Homo-oligomer: A and B are copies of this chain.
């Protein structure tokens, strides 16, 4: 199973660590290259929302599920989930099953309110899931097949309801939270909370002498 990177693993994967320095108790600790971190987190944000037709198939179909739930149509929702489970078992899932439900609910009032308030596919669909959860539980485990289909989406949706995201979606999570705080959609990335949380998490972790000697300035 393909585990989420820790903060330190993430920093190391994207070459974000830096010789910081001398804060007593911070011996054998690294800093973060903020500019590079900004770029990584900006890339994580993914595409602008620009009509559901342009979402990936998986983002489209799960959006449809959540919209159906927002509109109290559990049957339409469970039918997608069921076909996707069955057809995913059978070897490649039928994301077209969601199209009728998209057509019915994409301009419904509650959906239009979510789309109006978020600029990115990932922040739109997070708020669709948050909103669907006023109807019922809607766990990650209704859509287990998404992990191998779309890792970034899987992690974003598993962070809805959580206070701290996985580092691999900390950018879109920070942005989503910033959009809610601003009370409008934002095209300008608002990912500064991801940078500060990475720095904090990375400074908790001691490096080996070998690791410290690798730190570039």
**CB proximity to B under 8 Å, residues A75-112:** 82, 85-86, 88-93
Q: A144-B144, A144-B145, A145-B144 are in contact. Are A158 and B1 (CB under 8 A)?
A: no
Chain B contacts for A92, CB-based, 8 A: 1, 3
CB distance from A105 to the nearest CB of B (A): 24
Does A166 sit at the interface, judged by CB under 8 A? yes
Does A161 sit at the interface, judged by CB under 8 A? no
CB distance from A91 to the nearest CB of B (A): 4
**Is B141 a contact of A85 with CB atoms below 8 Å?**
yes
Does A148 sit at the interface, judged by CB under 8 A? yes
A154 and chain B: residue at smallest CB distance: B89
**What is the count of identical protomers in the complex?**
2
Does A139 sit at the interface, judged by CB under 8 A? yes
Chain B contacts for A91, CB-based, 8 A: 1, 3-4
**Is B3 a contact of A141 with CB atoms below 8 Å?**
no
Does A44 sit at the interface, judged by CB under 8 A? no
Q: Point out which of A82, A141, A158, A166 has the most chain B C-beta atoms below 10 A from its C-beta.
A: A141
**CB proximity to B under 8 Å, residues A1-18:** 1, 3-4
Cβ 8 A contact of A90, one of B4, B82, B139:
B4
A89 and chain B: residue at smallest CB distance: B158
Does A140 sit at the interface, judged by CB under 8 A? yes
Does A149 sit at the interface, judged by CB under 8 A? yes
Chain B contacts for A85, CB-based, 8 A: 139-141, 144
**CB proximity to B under 8 Å, residues A131-180:** 139-141, 144-145, 147-149, 158, 166
> What separation, in Å, do the CA atoms of A89 and B145 have in the docked complex?
11
CB distance from A87 to the nearest CB of B (A): 9
Cβ 8 A contact of A140, one of B3, B89, B140, B149:
B89
**Is A90 a contact of B141 with CB atoms below 8 Å?**
no
Chain B contacts for A1, CB-based, 8 A: 88, 91-93, 145, 148-149
